[model samples]
Target: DVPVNLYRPNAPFIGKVISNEPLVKEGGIGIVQHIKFDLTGGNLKYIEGQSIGIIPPGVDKNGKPEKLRLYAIASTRHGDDVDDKTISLCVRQLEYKHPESGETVYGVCSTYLTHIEPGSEVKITGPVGKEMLLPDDPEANVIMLATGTGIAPMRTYLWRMFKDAERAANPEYQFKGFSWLVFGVPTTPNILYKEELEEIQQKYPDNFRLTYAISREQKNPQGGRMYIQDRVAEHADELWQLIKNEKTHTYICGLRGMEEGIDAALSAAAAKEGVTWSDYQKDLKKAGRWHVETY
Candidate 1:
């Protein structure tokens, strides 16, 4: 269930899209819409990496949109005004047959999203996510890991961190910190925001580095599934050092498996580093050093 605070506080909204276009998309992801809309409500203020919950009505028998799905807000209030709402998401499209009718079914929200044209009014609310929030301590180091659509929040998080005005304490220098992003998708075409990452690196190559682990396409060294932990283990020493360092933070998102393999990998790394695995994790949790978001 979504907390009530996610909705734009006290601001009723009604609007229409001025223009619509796909922002780096994949086939199964065609339904996520990104458009500029006329906003009539009060001032809207939000940080990046937040969430918005779209209230979906229920079934025909139930007579309304089923329920609201919480989508990570992909845009920022950087250029949006109160009368002009701004946001987007990397929505996934699903294909299946409705149980009752035995007829091929199209996803309700996905269909609605793809069919909407310019001048259409769409309901949207919230700027939600805490994982991507940058540290107040200017010296803090950040490591980001994302898979599939999980990159949405990371993008928002990094974009804000790199902004000139929000470059908090370092007055004489451009704001920077170690942000190592490890992302993955099936193939090159499915990768999200490659150009954006490039531009970010070009702007600050010294502090920001990106590595993509294409699991599906990358050949297995011993003929096995090429997974993230394999890539993670390659830089185990550096990763461990960063995590052990004070004020450094790691952000991980986007996976439904919820398996413990990554945890196991961390344990292995701890063992290799000659530390008590259990104690290391306990300390990390106590210090709020390791963070993860999964759905």
Candidate 2:
């Protein structure tokens, strides 16, 4: 079915903030928010892995209206309320040092989103995007790779696969197959949805595997920062075995640069068995088994 944008661009739906909470702990390096909006009063429908556009309230530096920024929907189709009238976003306040001035610059839309009040209203549009879509097969072996805020879609995946309420809500998608998530974060505190992910892992030990690459608090075997690629390398052979299966669907999301490292690691593992990683990945893409969204 084609995804419908119930509300058009200029006639965006005004969704009120139902809840706005921080994903990271106090000592975490940056601000990451788990913001949910109340869509009960509108016809804003969205599926898992879709995105919503937020139009920040203000004009740009050129005296024109600020453009909308797309944020990945972090909730299941039924949403957090299980009411199907809500949508959530995982937003990271973008901050970086200016190249010429050396001054800290913050993202306009992100800053506005991270600082919004609970009762505040936000202009929202679209439930668009099909790149990171979850496969429909219940018995599919799902492999998820993500870093930092990229966990947004992964959150929806985990919830749909393991959340009791979500499973009940989505009767057609009871996952009896295996799911493995390898998350990369800077520190322990930066692990978003930590308790929920662990609870699912603990309950469904045979079906779920939770792995984290904590950069600041952990080190690779080579004595460098323990990035996601290092963790992928550690399990390259096992991952290769899974990837060879037609029933396995692999997803990659997060930093754009991390893709190269992951591909390199997987390539070495594929080489050991006389299989070309790029060729194999191309076949997977052709078969619709490889899903990726990076920025």
Candidate 3:
């Protein structure tokens, strides 16, 4: 049967997944599952801010391929193209042993994704998301917030900004804007790539700011993980100021619950500043300052 999602016909092309497995395992704390895949070709060049859609078929009880689910591509255009061959995707396992039913509900893509090895091929099509693109202006202001594997794209964005200082487009993607990031984890110990993040922060301390919040085993109240939006609350006034001051943009990617929380907090924050959130949202939308991606 023809795949409903894909308009182009054929098997999914071959590309390689980067060495992102350890990054995933270390980031999530418990480290249960991790999978990586590749997406590189002659005609397909993806932007740093775009995502991918997979035409994955599922496995039945008899072990046949099932339908596919789309996952974001966490590699910037520069990095993927520059590195050659592999693009990175980091997905977490969502299924758990239900104590009540004892039924291990299989999570759609996570089950298959977590076990795939290097050089293994998968079906994917993309650069399909227009939801949360970054601003092109060199001086434009932006911020990002994420939790768990939500930080995947953030890794791409941050790496581009901090590593490739000469991308032709933005000579100063790192130093020009007030780029803030807030990430949450169950424990501070579980935070991913802390050393690399610290290096990046220290390298361009003036342009980059980062916050880490942990729900469990927080080092202190500062590590509190009510989630990214909650951490945003601690700096609401400043955050709002950044958004309002420079027509700042924000990027959010994570669980669906965080979406709701961020929406409410943003609305409330705008209200406190004497503007209706409806107007705030609309005006920002006009200015291209709001970007949200939740799963």
User: In TM-score terms, which candidate is top?
Assistant: 2
Global Cα lDDT for candidate 1? 0.63
CA lDDT, candidate 1, residue 113: 58
Write model 3 residue lDDT over 1-295, tens digit each, in one string: 1113232324455555444364443335545333455545534556556666655445767786666566766766655445544566666666778889998776766756665667666667655666676666656676888888777778777777776533554564534777788988786556766777888889788878989877775443455445666777667777877878664778888877887766676778888868776777777777767777787
Give the Cα lDDT of each candidate.
0.63, 0.90, 0.66
In model 1, state the lDDT of residue 189.
60
Model 2, residue 106: C-alpha shift (Å) = 1.3
Residues 104-167, model 1: lDDT tens digits: 7777665665556788876666555555555556567888877877787777666656645434
Write one digit per residue (lDDT tens) for candidate 2, span 83-160. 888888999999999999999999999999999999998999997788778888999999999998889999999998
Name the runs in model 1 displaced over 4 angstroms. Answer: 1-12, 24-40, 57-61, 79-85, 96-105, 128-132, 163-174
Candidate no. 1 TM-score = 0.79
Candidate 2: which pairs clash? none
Worst 10 residues of 2 by lDDT: 1-10
Candidate 3 backbone overlaps, count: 11
Q: Runs in model 3 with CA error above 4 Å?
A: 1-11, 16-20, 24-28, 32-42, 55-58, 61-65, 164-175, 219-225
Model 2 residue 34 lDDT score: 95
